């Protein structure tokens, strides 16, 4: 049975050893496959503005060594947003660790909003198409999505022409947004017949912006199955296919017959 | 200002003074445009498998009548769901009668549903490529949505790109689905940038279908600004432009570059 771990975390101690222990009860609980939030190897986004250069690259190279090694340790993987520093330039990008090597899926759309500047902070390659990432975990058709692209409707015509089982959503969200991140997430899986894991950080920033975690797992019916608190914690969730909540609502049938 | 009234009404009967009224309150609020949701001039669709041609027939000509002669008494425009009895078949469609003239909205999605099969029952020409119903009402740039079309993107893009006011539903919703309607509407105005009004009807059916009606006016930010209950109300909005929130997602300045 294939299952998945998501950790809701703040930023990650330097020391691997609290890490370590939510990666050994993933693998006792049959998990292979574990999705952290966004900033939780980095420090969040407003904090990197008063950081040096050098110390956001000793936080993300040493953390990526951990990630590496837990992953070869554990034989499982490991999927984690990760701020890329090379030379003076920054890139946003997710990580899959896995023991035999690491991939990585570069950011198509960031956020341009003054107080959180991702697009000016980040020099992430802008596509002249964009195309959701995708891979398949054992017998499911998974995609991974970052927060703030999961608003816009390009990229879920792509999960429904792809059939995908599962998408993950890592994300970075705000406690007065919670109500609608549950509306907008619930009508993404609901519409186009797939399960949403979104994973979120905790902690609460200088500026005193809140975050409430609040990870959750809805099913492809477009209903929350499991929720987690505003506290660190790991949720364990047993995704399924959406071959059979597809044929309900039928919406991928009535769309394939236009030419649009 | 521009100015909408969205009724809340059950299935009208042959003779009614209910239409008249409201319309006579609207007008004399400065609105120039009524919505009416999804079979209030026809009897319910469940209800409409077991009535004659000619009975159905009769009730639709009538309610037309009645529409074109009160649009011109009062010199305003009614948008009203509407079943068209034609020569071999029955037909559903949106009308948008106006002081000048009527005009028809075919819709292009119907629901397949073995319970509530419109697709079997009308016989509504199907097209080979979505487009959107677009109207301008006074300043507004406005669209017209079947309840059930609401539920696909191909719509919502069309509406995005022509940089859409107010997006108007009829539609007839049930009280299982009351929440996730709301999420849906609310996630649409929110992701597109548009003001959405969804008009629904009141009323029981013969199968114990509840229509708990709800209508309800959603902003460009994606938050509730009116909301009726279950009896029949009128609901009178102020729809403002989108351009503030267009501005401040700006979701279309980040999709239109690709």
Known sequence: ??????????????????????????????????????????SFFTELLHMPKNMIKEQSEAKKESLIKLAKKYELEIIAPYVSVEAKS???????????GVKSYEQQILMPYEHWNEEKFFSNKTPSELKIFTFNYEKLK???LFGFETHFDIFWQQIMAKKIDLVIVPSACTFESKQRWEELLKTRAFLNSTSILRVNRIGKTKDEW????????????????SKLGSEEEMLIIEPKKSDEARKLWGFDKIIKEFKN
């Open 90 to 100: 920054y890139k946003k990008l997710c990580l899959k660790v896995t023991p035999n």
């Open 1 to 42: 049975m294939s299952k998945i771990a998501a950790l809701q975390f703040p930023t990650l101690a330097l020391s691997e050893s609290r890490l370590d222990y939510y990666l050994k009860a993933s693998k006792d609980n049959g998990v292979n496959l574990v999705v952290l939030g966004e900033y939780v190897i980095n």
């Open 142 to 144: 998974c995609a991974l």
């Open 210 to 225: 809140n975050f409430y975690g609040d990870t959750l797992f809805i099913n492809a019916f477009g209903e929350i199955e």
